[PDB]
């Protein structure tokens, strides 16, 4: 051999990011979250992106014998089984066959969430059952919107940083591209006094208490700390700890430099 078959381009619907909630039981939700845990497109998701997406999933009922999907039938839809039994089968030529089975578990269609991809088999309800469905345009809006809301603005935080005021836009986005997130529990230590100053932080939610060896500051949403790691690597004068549950933006400072060179060069210009 299949060595000479060319590889077609693929392309999903556009959404330039510049109301949907389908009720489901507490448990129905958890089971749904576990059936998606290890699916590529869900693995790596804000638990809020995840939550938004799990809202979007619509209920789909089926009487026994009903066709959930038809081979070659359109696949703009991902499906995860709630309850029921299900036969899978393919008309391989030529020849209609049964392949495997479904017993109240299992999913199919994920590639649909990326681009149009005609179901490879017909799935048939071997009893009364229910599924949750997800359609590509819906799913992609959610996730595109959610990231754009997390891109500009993730920045403002960055452009409220005195050391970075003199960055160009093309450069600040470079940082928006990669800046990580960290989540912290009550009293968990964010920074350790006398530790190598490896990166700076910005609070997205919660409160951070800066203390020395004696409360010497409290940071709320939109406020930075450790920001000295940019100008010098000399050991933290103070420590940081979480007050409640904090989420932090964390930027390793070296990475910063691979992108932009040393922050001090910036703070000239």
């Amino acid at each position: 051999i299949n060595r000479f078959t060319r590889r077609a381009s693929v392309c999903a619907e556009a959404y330039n990011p510049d109301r949907i909630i389908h009720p489901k039981t507490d448990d129905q939700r958890n089971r749904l979250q576990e059936a998606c845990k290890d699916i590529l497109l869900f693995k790596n998701l804000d638990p809020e992106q995840m939550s938004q997406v799990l809202d979007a999933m619509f209920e789909k009922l089926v009487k026994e014998g009903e066709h959930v999907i038809d081979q070659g039938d359109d696949g703009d839809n991902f499906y995860v089984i709630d309850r029921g039994t299900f036969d899978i089968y393919v008309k391989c030529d030529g020849v209609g066959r049964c392949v495997g089975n479904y017993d109240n578990r299992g999913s199919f269609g994920e590639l649909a969430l990326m681009y149009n991809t005609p179901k490879a088999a017909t799935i048939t309800a071997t009893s009364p059952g229910a599924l949750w469905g997800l359609d590509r345009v819906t799913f992609r809006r959610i996730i595109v919107k959610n990231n754009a809301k997390k891109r500009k603005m993730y920045e403002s935080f960055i452009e409220s940083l005195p050391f970075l005021k003199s960055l160009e836009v093309s450069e600040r986005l470079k940082v928006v591209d990669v800046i990580g997130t960290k989540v912290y529990n009550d009293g968990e230590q964010i920074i350790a006094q006398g530790d190598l100053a490896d990166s700076f932080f910005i609070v997205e939610s919660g409160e951070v208490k800066i203390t020395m060896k004696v409360e010497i500051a409290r940071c709320f949403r939109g406020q930075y700390f450790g920001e000295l790691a940019l100008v010098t690597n000399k050991p933290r004068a103070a420590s940081a700890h979480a007050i409640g549950t904090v989420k932090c933006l964390a930027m390793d400072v070296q990475a910063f430099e691979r992108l932009l060179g040393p922050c001090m060069e910036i703070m000239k210009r």
Binding site: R6, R7, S9, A14, L40, E110, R258, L259, L260
Partner: protein
């Protein structure tokens, strides 16, 4: 030299960009000889100009099919962008036009066929053979990026060899002008950057990613990430974990790691020194970036021509008749074409 000319290319482009060429010619100015490729959707043809007797490649696009597949915005890009750029390795748009049923881009013929076809026949490429091609893409992507244009579809099926063994980049369907960040999930599966897959929003970085892939394929004979079902290909691309065949010279495999880097803070082309990181790499030591640009370098392969209008380096498709309806279709959507 290296200094002003930049600005001149943007001066040039911008001026052509804001007021594009329109219905240069028309269908009956051409004879339709043979299909070269089934465009989606789609059909690229060899055509003989009449007044000149000279040959071209005609890209026929069914206006309705484009609308049904939702490629309105992309199509306008292909054409707008293509008739506004100029660079020795970008294919030339000679005339453009439309009629009741189709859109037409007429281009220079590249008799040599697709890289893909050669690569596949030949198995793989020696490294200097790979390097020679890869140099043109690097220079081409710098030209494009400088204008704030990304290409987004790098693959040996969109890279054609011209009569002098050089390359002409070809399919601009996904090319676009991005000042901040763009989100469309598009390209070719084996070549998608991980940020595209995960809908992170992205710009110039994805091209350089794709460059790493191309190069690895040009030298290996197969791409870095492959698998039975696509989702597994994506799974692999997201781990960015890659094996190199035994024969990859150490410097090659070194370059591939810097380009095939899922971590944007470490991916060549994307860092402080931009592209120079790639040019002044270790796998381009023997490359005189100036020479290649002037096409003064010995091509490690010249496709065999015959007379003009020879299609030997291309595959054979079944010829259907190009229907032009008496009813104009989708007029409003392509006004700007």
């Amino acid at each position: 030299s290296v200094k002003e000319f930049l600005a001149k290319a943007k001066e040039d482009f911008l001026k052509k960009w804001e007021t594009p060429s329109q219905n240069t010619a028309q269908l009956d100015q051409f004879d339709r000889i043979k299909t070269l490729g089934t465009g989606s959707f789609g059909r690229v043809m060899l055509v003989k100009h009449k007044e000149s007797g000279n040959h071209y490649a005609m890209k026929i696009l069914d206006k309705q099919k484009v609308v049904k597949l939702k490629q309105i915005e992309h199509t306008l890009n292909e054409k707008r962008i293509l008739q506004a750029v100029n660079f020795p390795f970008l294919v030339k748009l000679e005339f453009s036009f439309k009629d009741n049923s189709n859109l037409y881009m007429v281009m220079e013929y590249v008799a040599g066929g697709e890289m893909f076809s050669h690569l596949r026949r030949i198995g793989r490429f020696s490294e200097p053979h790979a390097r020679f091609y890869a140099a043109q893409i690097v220079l081409t992507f710098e030209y494009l990026h400088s204008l704030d244009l990304i290409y987004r579809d790098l693959k040996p099926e969109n890279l054609l060899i011209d009569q002098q063994g050089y390359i002409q980049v070809t399919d601009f369907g996904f090319a676009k002008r991005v000042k901040g960040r763009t989100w469309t999930l598009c390209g070719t599966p084996e070549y998608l950057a991980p940020e595209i897959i995960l809908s992170k929003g992205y710009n110039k970085a994805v091209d350089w990613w794709a460059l790493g892939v191309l190069i690895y394929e040009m030298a290996a004979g197969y791409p870095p990430f492959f698998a039975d079902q696509p989702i597994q290909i994506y799974e692999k691309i997201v781990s960015g974990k890659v094996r190199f065949p035994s024969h990859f010279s150490s410097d090659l495999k070194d370059l591939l790691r810097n380009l095939l880097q899922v971590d944007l803070t470490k991916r060549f082309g994307n860092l402080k020194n931009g592209v120079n990181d790639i040019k002044n790499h270790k796998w381009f030591a023997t490359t005189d970036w100036i020479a290649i640009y002037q096409r003064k370098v010995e091509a490690p392969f010249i496709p065999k021509f015959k007379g003009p209008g020879d299609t030997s380096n291309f595959d054979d498709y079944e010829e259907e008749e190009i229907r032009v309806s008496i009813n104009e279709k989708c007029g409003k959507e392509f006004t700007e074409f």
